[PDB]
Amino acid sequence: SMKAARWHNQKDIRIEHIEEPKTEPGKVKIKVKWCGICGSDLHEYLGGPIFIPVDKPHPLTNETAPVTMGHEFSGEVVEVGEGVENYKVGDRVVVEPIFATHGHQGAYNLDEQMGFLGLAGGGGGFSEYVSVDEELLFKLPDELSYEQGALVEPSAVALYAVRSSKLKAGDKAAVFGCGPIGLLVIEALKAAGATDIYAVELSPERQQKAEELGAIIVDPSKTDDVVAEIAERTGGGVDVAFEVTGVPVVLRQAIQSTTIAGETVIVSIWEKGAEIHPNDIVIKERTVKGIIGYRDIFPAVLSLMKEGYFSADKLVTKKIVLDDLIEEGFGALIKEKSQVKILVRPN
Amino acid sequence: SMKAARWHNQKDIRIEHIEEPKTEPGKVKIKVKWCGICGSDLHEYLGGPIFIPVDKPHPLTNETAPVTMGHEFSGEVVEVGEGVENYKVGDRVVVEPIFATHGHQGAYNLDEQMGFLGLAGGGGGFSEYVSVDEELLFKLPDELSYEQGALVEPSAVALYAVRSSKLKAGDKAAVFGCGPIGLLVIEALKAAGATDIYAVELSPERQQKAEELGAIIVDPSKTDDVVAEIAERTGGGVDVAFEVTGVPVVLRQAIQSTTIAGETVIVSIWEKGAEIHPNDIVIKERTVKGIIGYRDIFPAVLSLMKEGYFSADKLVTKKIVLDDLIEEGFGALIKEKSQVKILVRPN
Ligand SMILES: [Zn+2]
Numbered sequence A, B: 001s002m003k004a005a006r007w008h009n010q011k012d013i014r015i016e017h018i019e020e021p022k023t024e025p026g027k028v029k030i031k032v033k034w035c036g037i038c039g040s041d042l043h044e045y046l047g048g049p050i051f052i053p054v055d056k057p058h059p060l061t062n063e064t065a066p067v068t069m070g071h072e073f074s075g076e077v078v079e080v081g082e083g084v085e086n087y088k089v090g091d092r093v094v095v096e097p098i099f100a101t102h103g104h105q106g107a108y109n110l111d112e113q114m115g116f117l118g119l120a121g122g123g124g125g126f127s128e129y130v131s132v133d134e135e136l137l138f139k140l141p142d143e144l145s146y147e148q149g150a151l152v153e154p155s156a157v158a159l160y161a162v163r164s165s166k167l168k169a170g171d172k173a174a175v176f177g178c179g180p181i182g183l184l185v186i187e188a189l190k191a192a193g194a195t196d197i198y199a200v201e202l203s204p205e206r207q208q209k210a211e212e213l214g215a216i217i218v219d220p221s222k223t224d225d226v227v228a229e230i231a232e233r234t235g236g237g238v239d240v241a242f243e244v245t246g247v248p249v250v251l252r253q254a255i256q257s258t259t260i261a262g263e264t265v266i267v268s269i270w271e272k273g274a275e276i277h278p279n280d281i282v283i284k285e286r287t288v289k290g291i292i293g294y295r296d297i298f299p300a301v302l303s304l305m306k307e308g309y310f311s312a313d314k315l316v317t318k319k320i321v322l323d324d325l326i327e328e329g330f331g332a333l334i335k336e337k338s339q340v341k342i343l344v345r346p347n
């Protein structure tokens, strides 16, 4: 009675019909217009479960697989719960898909029982309807399209990384790894006023997107020493380096490419250890900083989009319908290194 | 004439007689009373040269090996140069032994041509007399003995690490490795208001000195998991951890022993790589911070000494004469783990 994409087991995401969820007193029913593919969705497709509860129920959702998937979405309010006064039918909204013990207060991205809508349960954007509590809503300005709204959440991970960093207007930066996440970091750096952004990337398609976003390409295959090159063109190093590859050798380079008191922000996911040179941190009084999730960031993202940043013209590379999610969505992400963000339409 | 201790080659420090230096217009001649052993001095004895210029002259000293050794010293002004107005004969002084391109301005400890008095040249405290420029002098308050003055420089290394950290009054800290440097950090932590300081140390003599300075002993041989113990006695981890062992496994533990947004300050020396878990930094939004030398710190140290911190009663464990420097000094640092700081008297 509602078409949805549910995760049942690894490599087993089904496009099935499930019952429309009832709008409970605290909630608001959204008819989804667009939803993106996180790459976390890609990671649970190929090698889950990681964030999807399967063995024990998730503490806050209290639900196990199968779960509907999809954060990074926007849509139109079609029905309003019992206690809701800040949203009427017809309102255009986006969702900050974080479940936390005490709500969106304090450091909710680091809450012990934290979970994601579309991963831990509570609905998902790869469906026609999702019923979320109004504490997770943001009004979509009329200037911004629904597709722009579907880009709010993934832009937030990038912007929260840049805002969390020592970066100031006019400073120089480096992004190591310019996949979909690294590219969003480049756009966020330009919003924050970064000038020279040194993008270290091998793939020509990804090099040609980073250059469109305003970065300088440092091809590891065309330079003898990447760290020496960034040091030469900056006179001692960039002010902030962003590690997005998850490669141990590259984490070393990111630290070595910062100047006196520079900062290395780790954005990538790590499963195994990595050998660093702690001397490189001590010699120049450097700093390494961890970043996960985001918090108190959606208004800033929404405001920057009204100014042209995080444009869907630059970041959205494909629009698909929910039926074609397996082959035209995940499949395209697996085969085409040129894909940045893919938006999914329920019908 | 003048008796001095010179570094000629590795494991080759000689007690010789050299020329009393001229008091040049900008300089001040100090009759040294006491000088300490940094462990940097010990490291040049066992495996130098490291900071000792040998091949090429040092940029600022313009001086090659051999060199007189010894920073962390105090003494009595016995002759004053042509341009000096802030120091008269008889003044009791201590020396901040940093040579930098632009003097003691900006971040002179990270200056490209940076060098240490007693290592890069320009005299040293293991001699009867030293001729330094007055920008490197600080008046020794009458409350503090000459022995107290000789502790300013090593105290500055410890205090500068603590002040450079996110530590606030009441917070909890952990010190991994309680050798001579770690012990000075514990005393510095108490000055800054650290309450529960978890000292991770195997040596009973060093455990019982750290306990005297106000820390809690975490014996690795008496607990199955060091970080698990520190994590629960703090309810999730300390706020700042100090790594002083230089062992890769311990750097992992220091990072893992910090709480949400915790900070790991590296104080140890590193020559080879070290395997960390970058995931440990990302999950809890942690920070790892490098610290080398010190800057703009001597007045703070001197003031805290007037209040009883960094007391020589607690930190000076042996006083020797310069003649016995090799066997009762360096040898004692290698063989007796109960030694904290050893002071050396010229005659
Ligand atoms: Zn996401």
Ligand SMILES: [Zn+2]
Pocket (backbone or CB within 6 Å): B038, B040, B071, B072, B153, B154
């Ligand atoms: Zn020293």
